[PDB]
């Protein structure tokens, strides 16, 4: 009888509703706004986790580390444009060397 | 000749692009985004859009000429504009 | 006595990759990402509601904020998922 | 010319470059400037049309342009 189960989701709906109600955003909150927000958040999380898992599997690993998250984020133009001013700790850089330097 | 032109243009504050071509271009770009419906436009909206666009272009030209002077030339090239857009970092140069 | 999104991220990971684990630092990074996106979307929806002289945040404001914030294909798929979840939730 | 993008003539681009402080320009600059202006206009107009059609209106208002410019990180003071 859960709301997240009623909407077919894994993310919580009541928690997002409470955070919206106690976040100083508006005097009133509707009924479908937390469902919409939880669905969008779960979709984004699933995309990022799938890309990171593919990176870790191609890197011959079994566990995801921040390096895999960095590799997944910086190799997708839309995700890179979304997180354009974010720094990931212990993530490193992409192996990009200028072609003029290499023989 | 060019020196007097630059010195006179840097003192004025009026718009440099005509109104009718800008209006036509903006209207066609706006109708390209919707589903075929035609939207009306206020005059102040087009004026504000033109002001913002011209300010952006002048600032970008200043940055590109800084890059041109760094490269050791006096003539502006498209690669200077491209490098300025790249250094500005995905949010200011685009 | 602290709150996070660890269990839900783990459930999503088990749905996507059934034989893959995750460290603690990556989980902290995921929590930070979720909080950041939540804050952005909620702030944009609040601004939208204030511009049009309204005192309610509905799914329409959330949809418009998602369209304003995310790039093209991400926005399209997010809107699709959101409306799908809404129409599945209202039919129960 | 006939195409609407060709309405931005070379004298106007030359005047903008001269106001910017440029002394000597090349021939390939005008098409690049047209493309950059087109990208800028596309972004701003998309945001403004979204703001306009969120409300149930059919006319683009200067406040929509101001809000789009502000949310893109560029504040305009004159038309507030």
């Amino acid at each position: 009888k859960s709301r997240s189960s009623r909407a077919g989701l894994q993310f919580p709906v009541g928690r997002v509703h409470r955070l919206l109600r106690k976040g100083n955003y508006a005097e009133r909150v509707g009924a479908g706004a937390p469902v919409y927000l939880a669905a969008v958040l779960e979709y984004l999380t699933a995309e990022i986790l799938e890309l990171a898992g593919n990176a870790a599997r191609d890197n011959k690993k079994t566990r995801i580390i921040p390096r895999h998250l960095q590799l997944a984020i910086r190799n997708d133009e839309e995700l890179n444009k979304l997180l354009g001013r974010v720094t990931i700790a212990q993530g490193g850089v992409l192996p990009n060397i200028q072609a003029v330097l290499l023989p | 000749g060019w020196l007097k032109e630059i010195r006179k243009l840097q003192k004025s504050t009026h718009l440099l692009i005509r109104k009718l071509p800008f209006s036509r271009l903006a209207r066609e770009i706006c109708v390209k985004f919707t589903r075929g419906v035609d939207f009306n436009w206020q005059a102040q909206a087009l004026l504000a859009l033109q002001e913002a666009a011209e300010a952006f272009l002048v600032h970008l030209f200043e940055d590109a000429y800084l890059l041109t002077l760094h490269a050791g030339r006096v003539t502006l090239f498209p690669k200077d504009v491209q490098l300025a857009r790249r250094i500005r970092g995905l949010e200011e140069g685009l | 006595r602290k709150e996070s999104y660890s269990v839900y991220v783990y459930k999503v990971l088990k749905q996507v990759h059934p034989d893959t684990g995750i460290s603690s630092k990556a989980m902290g990074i995921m929590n930070s990402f979720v909080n950041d996106i939540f804050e952005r979307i909620a702030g944009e929806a609040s601004r939208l509601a204030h511009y049009n002289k309204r005192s309610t945040i509905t799914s329409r404001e959330i949809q418009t904020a998602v369209r304003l914030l995310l790039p093209g294909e991400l926005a399209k798929h997010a809107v699709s998922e959101g409306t799908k979840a809404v129409t599945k939730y209202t039919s129960s | 010319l006939r195409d609407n993008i060709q309405g931005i003539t070379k004298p106007a681009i030359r005047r903008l470059a001269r106001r910017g402080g440029v002394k000597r320009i090349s021939g390939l600059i005008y098409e690049e400037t047209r493309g950059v202006l087109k990208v800028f206009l596309e972004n701003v107009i998309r945001d403004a049309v979204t703001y306009t059609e969120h409300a149930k209106r059919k006319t683009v208002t200067a406040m929509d342009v101001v809000y789009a410019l502000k949310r893109q990180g560029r504040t305009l003071y004159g038309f507030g």
Binding site: E77 | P78, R86, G93, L94 | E73, H77 | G35
Partner: peptide, 21 residues
């Protein structure tokens, strides 16, 4: 260059500072 669970093509950010015809 990659199709995820949903059929969204995930592309690499090749180039964005050059004007393309």
């Amino acid at each position: 260059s990659t199709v995820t669970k949903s059929r969204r093509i995930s592309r690499r950010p090749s180039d964005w500072w050059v004007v393309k015809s």
